[PDB]
Design a protein around this ligand. Sequence first.
Ligand SMILES: O=S(=O)(O)c1cccc2cccc(Nc3ccccc3)c12
Length: 133
Amino acid sequence: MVDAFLGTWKLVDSKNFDDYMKSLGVGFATRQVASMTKPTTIIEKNGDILTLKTHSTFKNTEISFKLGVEFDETTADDRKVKSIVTLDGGKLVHLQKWDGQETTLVRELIDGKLILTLTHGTAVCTRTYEKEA
Ligand SMILES: O=S(=O)(O)c1cccc2cccc(Nc3ccccc3)c12
C-alpha cells in the first residue's frame, strides 16, 4: 500500500546532497543553487498510476508511473534513464539505470516524516521532508 506516502512534502533537512549531485556529474553552479533551494515533493495516486512532482524556484520535474513497470524518465539533471518504482519493506524504491550506471532513490516513512535516501557510486544523501496540511 502506497497510501501513507501520498501528499505534499516539504524539505526540512539535507545531508550530502552535494556529494550525490557531484557523483552524478552535476556542475558546480547547479549544485550551488540546488543546495539552497527548498523543494516540494507531491505524490498523488489515480488507480494504479502514481504521479510524483518536484517543485521549486530552480528545477521542476514530474513523473507518472505504475509500481513495478519500467518507464522512461528524464531527470532534473538531464539524464535519460530507465526507471522502475517498487514497494520493498514498506519503502518506495526507485531505481534508475543509464549507460550501465545505477542510482536509487529510496523513500521511507519514519515517525510521519519522509526520509529520501539517494545513492550513486559511494555517495549517500539523506533528505528529510515533513507533510504539508
Ligand atoms: O529532484 S531531485 O530528486 O532532487 C534531483 C535528483 C537527482 C539529481 C538532481 C540534480 C540536480 C537537482 C535535482 N533536483 C532539485 C530539484 C529542486 C531543487 C533542488 C534540486 C536533482
